[PDB]
Amino acid sequence: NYLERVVAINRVSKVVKGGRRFSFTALVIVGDGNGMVGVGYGKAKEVPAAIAKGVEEARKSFFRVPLIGGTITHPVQGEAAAGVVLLRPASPGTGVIAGGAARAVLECAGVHDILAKSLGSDNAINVVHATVAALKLLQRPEEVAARRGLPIEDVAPAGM
RNA sequence: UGGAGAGUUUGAUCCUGGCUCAGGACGAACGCUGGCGGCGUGCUUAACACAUGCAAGUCGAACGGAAAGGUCUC
Ligand SMILES: [Mg+2]
Ligand SMILES: [Mg+2]
Ligand SMILES: [Mg+2]
Ligand SMILES: [Mg+2]
Numbered sequence: 001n002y003l004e005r006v007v008a009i010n011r012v013s014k015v016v017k018g019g020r021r022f023s024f025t026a027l028v029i030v031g032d033g034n035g036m037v038g039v040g041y042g043k044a045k046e047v048p049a050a051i052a053k054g055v056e057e058a059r060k061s062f063f064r065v066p067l068i069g070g071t072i073t074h075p076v077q078g079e080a081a082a083g084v085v086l087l088r089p090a091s092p093g094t095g096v097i098a099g100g101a102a103r104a105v106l107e108c109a110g111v112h113d114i115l116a117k118s119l120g121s122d123n124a125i126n127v128v129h130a131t132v133a134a135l136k137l138l139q140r141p142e143e144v145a146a147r148r149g150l151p152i153e154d155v156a157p158a159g160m
Numbered sequence: 161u162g163g164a165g166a167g168u169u170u171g172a173u174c175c176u177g178g179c180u181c182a183g184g185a186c187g188a189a190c191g192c193u194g195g196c197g198g199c200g201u202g203c204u205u206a207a208c209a210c211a212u213g214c215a216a217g218u219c220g221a222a223c224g225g226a227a228a229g230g231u232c233u234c
């Protein structure tokens with residue numbers, strides 16, 4: 001009962017003595033669609049083994065995302081090795097606006113209102129890494145309240 | 161109250177970095193097709209040259225006079 005989507009599929013080549021060797025790497029994003037998201041690179045000779053390894057790695061690397069009612073709390077600006085993607089909270093009426101990789105990761109996480117744009121490299125893996133990094137630097141208002149004190153210096157009009 | 165990406169350098173990879181695309185818009189033209197109504201718009205080029213008709217007249221309660229109208233008048 002998980003939601004999975006593949007982001008990029010490509011074939012690699014390595015030169016051997018007698019000829020050519022091929023292999024398949026397929027990044028797969030897995031989640032339950034509410035708050036859980038997983039990232040798996042994966043690599044094998046065949047595409048089924050590759051996406052199976054990607055799914056397994058995503059299950060292993062599942063990580064928690066902070067939500068405030070279907071949207072993120074405050075705008076964030078992550079950066080991968082080369083990917084640069086920023087995320088901003090949006091009105092509940094607005095859907096999810098993002099590219100391929102970013103939208104796949106966000107929809108596996110379970111975000112319904114988000115504004116995402118890519119400003120760095122256009123590589124799918126780096127875009128995914130930048131998006132998940134931004135999700136990591138995303139924090140919780142309750143956590144920052146624990147950090148400072150007096151959990152009143154925050155705005156949560158939606159609440160719930 | 162509002163931010164999408166895709167293709168393309170390599171034996172395969174990551175960057176940098178060009179080129180192309182997906183969208184909208186117009187006092188528009190072309191190709192094909194073509195029922196109607198509401199509302200708008202229509203020489204963007206030669207401030208090039210123009211046949212022709214109409215686009216600034218009015219007052220007799222300012223004035224001298226009577227061409228015409230009906231007119232009493234010979
Ligand atoms: Mg770029
Ligand atoms: Mg490019
Ligand atoms: Mg080489
Ligand atoms: Mg070369």
Ligand SMILES: [Mg+2]
Pocket residue numbers: 082175176
């Ligand atoms: Mg770079």
Ligand SMILES: [Mg+2]
Pocket residue numbers: none
């Ligand atoms: Mg006069």
